[PDB]
């Protein structure tokens, strides 16, 4: 299954995933292709921010759905 | 309730910016553009004070200037940033505790009355491209002491002039406490080297202008770590370096330094502020984490800015919003929520320091 991850700059990342993958697994996969530490990633879908412990299937994220990546501010 | 101050050189930058805008040669950043669009005057029809106030009004209650900004039109441009970093604000406050961070604060049995002067430090960190202050005080990545000196002189002197005068009017002297302004997050890569530069800058300012500060008596400088304890005589003034992690028993930022008391001195604390935020910054979201947020939480800063009457929580060291507000809006009821519900904006009187060292209206200083 492929899904997309769109960043603020409109750049689009392609990920290889399974419906049972957790949002935590997805963030880890984002770290692999992009080197962003997972605890800096907010993933948005369907107007919500997504919880690490739930699955893509939980959130009804299907093949070629697009997730939105927003980085954490950090002072 | 509060008073915005800025230097002569900052006024020149403002006049140049306003003229560039009037000519079409610059355009506002996103946040200033929003403030412009909510009022009716064109840039040209607006006086220099009104224009300055609208730029200051584009500040937001909380912003991390060191990481959250792009220094272009999508938030604040470099030209706006160069100005906003120079703007300071003072207010009289009630001080409910000594300013101790986290859990270490000591409540004043009788809350002290004094003043805060919020001043932003040199912004030498960025989540994107270089900042205006980096371009100002760095020579190919190396700190320039004279250039840093001129930056802090620009930003601190108008407040020293103000409180020198205010002490004279109250027939007292001034005791001023200063934290490690610009040595925290703002120092970015220069963290390990910045502290002697800031100390040197404070000394240089007091030394250069000793003749104009006869009512200033005690300067209590506390960068917490990384400096040696010292007292320097600067003219008639006593400049003290007392980093709290180095010198046990050091008096807090919100308390009278040794040799001062309320009968003989007014108490002023400098607050390490932020180019783009309201005074108190992250305490508007309820965080109590920086010099900016801790001192705002420990004073009635939020009441001075909003006009509301908060309540000091002795147990947690926080000045809380009005109790009616927290009941009605529990869950979305921090001070920044009070600002939204009440349509509060940050905008107040502004003066400039002229070439002779008098604080005057922007119009008066511009015409001289
Ligand atoms: N929020 C900025 C903090 C940066 C830092 O940790 O400087 C020491």
Numbering used by the authors:
A (entry chain C): 1 to 75
B (entry chain A): 42 to 409
What does the literature reporting this entry say, word for word?
ADP-ribosylation is a reversible post-translational modification involved in various cellular activities. Further analyses reveal DUF4804 as a class of MavL-like macrodomain enzymes whose representative members show unique selectivity for mono-ADP-ribosylated arginine residue in synthetic substrates. Crystal structures of several proteins in this class provide insights into arginine specificity and a shared mode of ADP-ribose interaction distinct from previously characterized macrodomains.
Despite several attempts, we were unable to crystallize a non-covalent complex of MavL with Ub, presumably due to the modest binding affinity between the two. We therefore resorted to MavL-UbVME covalent adduct, which we managed to crystallize and solve its structure to 2.19 Å. In the final refined structure, the Ub chain covalently linked to one MavL protomer protrudes away from its expected binding partner only to make contacts with the other MavL chain in the asymmetric unit. In this arrangement, the two MavL molecules, while sharing extensive intermolecular contacts on one face, create a concave surface to hold the intermingled Ub molecules. Nevertheless, we found an interface in which a MavL loop adjoining the active site, spanning Q103 to T115, forms a series of interactions with Ub, including R42. Mutagenesis on this loop showed that F105 and E107 play important roles in MavL activity. Additionally, the MavL-UbVME covalent complex exhibited similar catalytic activity compared to MavL, suggesting that this UbVME adduct may not represent an active-like conformation in solution. This is further supported by size-exclusion chromatography coupled with small-angle X-ray scattering (SEC-SAXS), where we found that in solution, MavL-UbVME is in a monomeric state with an overall elongated shape that does not suggest a biologically meaningful MavL-Ub interface.
